[PDB]
Ligand binder design. Sequence first.
Ligand SMILES: O=C(Cc1cc(C2CC2)c(-n2cc(CNC(=O)c3ccc4cc(F)ccc4n3)nn2)c(C2CC2)c1)NC1(C(=O)O)CCCCC1
Length: 153
Amino acid sequence: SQCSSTLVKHIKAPLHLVWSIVRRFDEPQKYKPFISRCVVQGLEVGSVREVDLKSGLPATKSTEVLEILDDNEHILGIRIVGGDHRLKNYSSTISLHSETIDGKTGTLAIESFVVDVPEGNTKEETCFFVEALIQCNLNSLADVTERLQAESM
Ligand SMILES: O=C(Cc1cc(C2CC2)c(-n2cc(CNC(=O)c3ccc4cc(F)ccc4n3)nn2)c(C2CC2)c1)NC1(C(=O)O)CCCCC1
């Protein structure tokens, strides 16, 4: 079985600023709070990033492949292909879109994933685990880019 879900986040910063952060396949640690470091050899499709998680977690690293980087429509797609975690066949897509909330331009982020349900867990538990982490990441992306936006004011 799999869990497939989509999360949406409203960000009070312009798309060009949010995308400048999200597009850095080589620098996820700039807003993903559970990631420490990241190294990419050679940002083209097929690029492989080796990700160091923060110390004190059950896993320590992830290996992920760049499946999509569309700089015109603002789509980033990745797939996890290794590491000392339990997540199997994880892939995700995030896209950014301009929107106007309260008369001010902002950015809508849409992030979708598909992942296997491990044999020892329920599908509900798998969805909850992944959705909570992505929500954490999207909340942090909003915090980071809204802060950059304020610092530019
Ligand atoms: O943000 C991150 C960073 C990131 C990446 C990883 C592992 C290396 C993939 C981890 N992790 C995972 C683990 C060990 N548990 C699992 O494997 C795991 C797998 C299936 C599970 C199913 C369940 F029912 C309950 C618990 C489960 N537990 N130890 N550390 C973390 C820790 C939990 C906070 C954070 N990753 C994502 C991103 O968008 O980059 C967003 C979340 C989804 C992956 C992509």
